[PDB]
Structure formats: structure tokens, C-alpha cells
Amino acid sequence: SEESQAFQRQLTALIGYDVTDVSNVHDDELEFTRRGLVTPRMAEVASRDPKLYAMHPWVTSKPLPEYLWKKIANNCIFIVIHRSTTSQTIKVSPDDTPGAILQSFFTKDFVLRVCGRDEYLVGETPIKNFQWVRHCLKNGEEIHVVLDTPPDPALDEVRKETVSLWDCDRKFRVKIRGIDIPVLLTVFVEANIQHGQQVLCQRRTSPKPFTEEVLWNVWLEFSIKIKDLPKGALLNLQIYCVRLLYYVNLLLIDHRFLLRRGEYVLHMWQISGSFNADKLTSATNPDKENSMSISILLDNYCHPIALPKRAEMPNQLRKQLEAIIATDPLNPLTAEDKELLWHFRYESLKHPKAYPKLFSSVKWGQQEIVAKTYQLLARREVWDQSALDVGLTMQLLDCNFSDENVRAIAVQKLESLEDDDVLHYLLQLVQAVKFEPYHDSALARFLLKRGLRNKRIGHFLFWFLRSEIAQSRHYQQRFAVILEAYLRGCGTAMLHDFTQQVQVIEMLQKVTLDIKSLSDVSSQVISQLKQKLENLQNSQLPESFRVPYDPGLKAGALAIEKCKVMASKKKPLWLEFKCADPTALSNETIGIIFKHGDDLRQDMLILQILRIMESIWETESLDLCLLPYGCISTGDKIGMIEIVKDATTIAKIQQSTVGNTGAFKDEVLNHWLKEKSPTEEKFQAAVERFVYSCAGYCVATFVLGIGDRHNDNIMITETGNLFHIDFGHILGNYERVPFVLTPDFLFVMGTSGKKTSPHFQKFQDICVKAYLALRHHTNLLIILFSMMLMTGMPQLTSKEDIEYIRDALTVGKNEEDAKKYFLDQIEVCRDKGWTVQFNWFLHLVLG
Ligand SMILES: COc1ccc(-c2cc3c(C)nc(N)nc3n([C@H]3CC[C@H](OCCO)CC3)c2=O)cn1
User: Fold this and answer.
1) What is the domain count for the chain?
2) Which residues form the C2 PI3K-type domain?
3) Ligand 1 centroid distance, CA of 86 (Å)
4) Of 599, 622, 645, which closes a domain?
């Protein structure tokens, strides 16, 4: 085969790493996992309905929220069906099927698409339940359909494809031959057997002089028995001299359940600059010329050794147990707590809330305990039956659980999330893949299934993986094998779509990096920008291409005219495009920023948390009006960002009538708003939208501990909606304010200095509801914030950083104590006025 063999050269193109390579493995686990994934891919490609798949309706079973029924006149939604230019309006009921809006139009074969978008209102679902509709209602807008012909399913077609460990009482051991580094103190090697961040045993070698080569040739006997090693155990090898210098890991029980034996030479990872996820990888360093290396031997018998495969209680105790179950994810367990959870494990099994703590009371270094823990997993009914709790589910998937049966039951719980909910957590489920001991895992397969099943999940899963494959040497192989599996099943139609997007953005990067090397901006630089963008619009670049942060959008021709290079430290591009779709109601460009020099992974994590907060507020009928704009990492330290329309900085609004100073004037923003409002009616709404959006960002920003911001990184729209930007900037550099509530903001609210008003009391009372709303999900947010810090921004691990959020969410405190607490934060804002903002001005503009 060849035509079905040049293919892999395209996949290796889309993936961005050569999955067939072997230059950096010490076993066949990746190969075994690729083979492993073939079955779940074809299972799902065969199992998906061709229609619904090709048109990926975007649907939701959650109730239509209150604040949107009130926006429906009376059981009456208006849709505008476009033919050519012969429009037409219809009175449709919220509970109306989409087809039925054809038994009601073919009365005065075909499918309804959305004007300007790749979105289809298809399938048996009430229109109240299509996201694009809900997006229309929320922003008060006519719903436009183009009414045309189905895409053809046939274009989504995929092209044609021994001794039992439990009989070994010998203490386990490993020989350290020694270490070699090509180029350079006293030095030694530390060997740990870890399971799930739990350390089972430790031994070291004697210290030695640090030279180009250091040999010991010692056996290190561990205090743990061969039969007592759990599946997922890591041998963790480290090098000290006290500071840590190099680490590497090796699974002691391989993907085949074999105790691991023989000679191993492993190139090790360095430490730059408390644990992030890179510390956990089974992947060996690819870079050999440079990397410290270690050489070991594992005993090597014949001799394949395969890992095989309730009463009452007092009352002081029960309440002690209840107090433990309740405590938050980050609150530590004493030995005393653990022995208690374990002894009363059966009474602990009735409370799913308890599972994270129960399965952390387990000594995984003991066969018989693990064996009892598996009996525990067989009596799992209460967990199996209870309503899905994503907060619970994520905790079992973090770095604290290495047993795959514990992790599998969390994944079981996820299988019952509707698509919509999958998109909310997708980014973090993919980061959670870094915590899996093995390349092939239930969570890895599950992400594969849900992608292959829904082009929308699938489009994002593509980019999230490609971002990691592009900037993570620790996990690229594994992510490569998951991407590869996904691409070989998405459909040739998707495959061509992904290829377009890749071709375009790769070009644009080149431009970006190139203009970047010429350096505020010279009109020499402004010149080449326009020039290269003209090159592109030629005989390479395809006509259009899906915008990656918003898959429903096709971008077409650029707008050379409007595109610019901005005056940042780095030189990011400000590009704009035409909607490639003629059926577009408007003619506004699609505006996208391109930047090198920031790791955009971190901004992605924050934005997606923001969407989750907006989703938590919808449960309580709150719309705090955030603008979590699109952001997609596409490669090392580089990617794109969506541009929000009709928006300036708050600092620019000040600099407009004070001119680069700090003489910030309390009345300037409310004057800018009135300045841009055609009616005092629109103006009132922009003031209403301000109060919500600003409150919304005070709470979220405060919980996430990124509320103390420079005035240049807070923006607003000509319509009152306020939003923060550039979250990577405070995260990735690290007198104080909790969030940013400034004299100009308060002034817009009807309060001066130390006063009060109907809008400010509206403000405070949206904050309180908001703040309390999030604390109802204290466990969700604590695990997400913790997993965020671990997989996304190293340096910000330590532990002490991770625990900021417990303080913020005020765990333990009762609502009334908590309500008061936030209001006091607001009051720290009223007190400092322009202080910090002025400080941020001196520092960030004058050093
Ligand atoms: C993590 O990296 C980054 C980098 C850039 C942004 C970013 C987002 C943004 C959005 C979503 N919407 C609108 N409307 N603008 C935006 N801007 C503008 C700020 C003012 C600037 O003007 C400088 C001369 O005054 C022009 C660009 C941004 O920078 C966010 N994160």
C-alpha cells in the first residue's frame, strides 16, 4: 500500500509530530496504544448517525433559563427564513420541532441552516433548546435561517483501514549503574517507588564527586515486596547535589501487566527556575546530545512475572467521620482521619462525597489492602446510581489517583454528560490525560469517543491536542497517539477542513514571527505587513477556513487595509477577515489577533473557567454577562485570539481626556458611555449591562485570584459590557485590591466617593448572589483551580499558591459570614480609589 501510505505523511502534518517514529521509546507502549485505540474509533465511526453527524446540531437539555422566558413575548419566538432575498418571518412556539417549522412553511427534503454560520437547526429538539437560538434571545436578536440542502453524509466517510507477581516475597530492587552527562559539586541518585503521589519506598546511593560520568554499580533494595507493587507504580529517579537537578520515571508494571526487567538507559528531564504534571511523565527526554542520562538494571529472572488481575458505629465517631467527608478537596487528611475512613469504609461507601478521601486512605503499597479496595469497588451501587457530580468526578481524575479502576469509575460517571457539558470540561479532561499512568486509559478512549461522535467536540479536541503536542515534550507522544486515532475517524470531510485551517494559520505565524524580528512601530514594518498579506492571498492559501476558536465561522479574504502590527513589547498582528459566507446578514470583519512570546495555554484555562462560572450562574438564573472571548494556542509560545467588537481599553478612555498621566478622572467613563449611546434608553441598558458585567468580573476575578489588574488590561464595549483580557500576563509574571472597582466604575453606578445609589445596591446584590452561587460549587472550582495550576502554569504550584482559593471561597464559613465577607472586599475597593491603579501606572509604564 502507498496511496494509503502517503496518508500518514498528511496525518504527521496535521498532528505536528511523527507518531510512527521510535527514536525515543524504551518499550512498545505507544505502538500498543495505537493498536489499542483502533477498536474504540471504529466502534464509534460505525455507531454514529450519518445525518446528525454531518450537521452537528448544537443542542442542550438544560431548561431554558428564567431570564430568557421573560424575553419571549408570549409563547412566541420569531424566526426569519431566508430563501434568496425573498425573506419571510414566522411565529414559532418555543416547543416547536425544527422539521415542524417546515410542515408550517411547506404550507405557504430541505434543512434550515443559520445565516452566516455552519450551524443547523436539525433533529428532534425544541428550538428553545438550540444554543444559537439561546444566544439570539440572550443578546436580543432576530433568528435568521437560510433554508437549504443537507450536507452529504458520504463526505464524512472514513477511508479503509509466566510467574504470578503475587508469589514473590523478595524485596524489590534496582541497580544503579550510574549516570553520564556530556557536559557540566557532589552528587547522588534518589530512587522512589510512587503510586498516586504517595511514596511507597525510598533509597539513595552514596554521594560521589560530580564528573562527566559517575558509576556506583550498587543494588538498591527497597523495603517493598515484588507482590506488593500496585499497577501504576512508578520508579522515580532523581539526581541531587541540596538541590534537585534531573528526574525520570519508569512504570514498574508495563501495559501488559509484566514486572519490568532488563537494562534501561533513560535520558532525563531537567529542572528550571511543589509539583506540576510534567514531573509525572513516563516519557523520556528526546534530546540526547544534551540530557543527563541514567543507567539501571532490574532483576531479570527467566521469567515473566505478570501482575495477576460493615456493622454499627458509636456517635462521636460518626460525627467525626461526617466532619471528614464534608471538608474540601484540598484539606489534608491526618493518619488519624485515614485509619477512620478505612475502618469505616463500608459506611463510607454510601456517600459518593467520601470517595476521594476514602480512596486516599488506601495504602496502595499493600496487596491485601488493594485487594480489599477492589471488593469495595464491587459494592459500588450508590455511586453508580447518584446524579453526576463533575466536582467528584474530576477529583478521582487528578494526580492523586494512580489505580485505573478508581479512575475508571469517574470516567463511567462522565459517559452520561450531554455534548454541551462535555464542551464545558473538554479542555480540562484533556489536561487530565497527563495524570493517567498509561497511554491507553478510559479517559483517553472516552475523549476519542465523544470527539468522533460530534464534530464540534471533535474540532476543539483537535486543537487542544495539537497545542499540547506542539509545546510539551513530556506528553506529546501520548497526545500524538490520541490525535492520530481521532483523525483516522473524524471523516475525510473533517480531515480536509483541518488541513485548510492548518495551512492558513501556519502561514500567518510565519508573518507574525517575521514582523516580530523588526523592532513602537516603524512605517517600514507597517509596509511589509501589507505586502506579505498580499503574497498570501495568492495561489497557496485556500479560499476560506474555519476560525478555530469559533468553529461555526468561515473566514475568507483578509482585509489588508485594516490589518496592523501593534505596539506591544512583542509585535502581535491585528488581522481582519471577511466572512467567507455570502449568507452573512452583516459585513463586519472577523477580527483575530496573532501573538508570539506568550504561552496562551494559561489564558485558555482561565477563559474556560469563566465559561464554567457563567454556566454555574445560569443554574441560579443569573447572567453576569462575561465576555470569555475565543483564544486558541496553536504552537510553541504562539497562537491567536478573538477580537471583541466595539471595544476600547478603560485606560484608553482615560488617556483620551487626561493623556498618559494618572490624573484619572472619576467621571470620564460614564461620559464615554453617554458619548456612544444613540438613546438614553440604550444608555440605561449599557449602564445595566455594566453593573452586571462588572460585578460578574469582580467575583470570578476575585475567586481566581487575578483581580488586581492594570487599567490597560480591562476593556469595555460601546454597549456597556466590560471584560478583562490578557490573563497570562498576571499569571505568568507572578498595596492591593481584591478585584478592580474604581472611582470611574462607581461613578457609572450612581455613587460618589463614599455614597450609595440604586445601581450600586443592585451591584452589591448581584455580587452576593454571584459569590454565594459559586460557593455552592466549592468542590468543582477547587479541583479545577488545582488542576489548572498543575497542568497549565508551573512555577505557580508550590502548594501555597494552590490553596489561595479556599480562602477566597471562604470554605467553612456559613453564607451570612460569607455574604458579609465579599461586601467587605467591595469596601476595600472603595477605600483605595486610584492608589493601586496609579501604582500599576508607575510600575508598568515607568518601572
Ligand atoms: C494573552 O495575550 C493576550 C493578548 C491580547 C489580548 C487582547 C484581546 C482583545 C479582545 C478580546 N477584544 C478586543 N476588542 N481587544 C483586545 N485587545 C486589544 C487591547 C488594546 C490594543 O490597543 C493597543 C494600543 O492602544 C489593541 C488590542 C487585546 O490586546 C488578550 N490576551
Assistant:
1) 5
2) 168-299
3) 39
4) 645
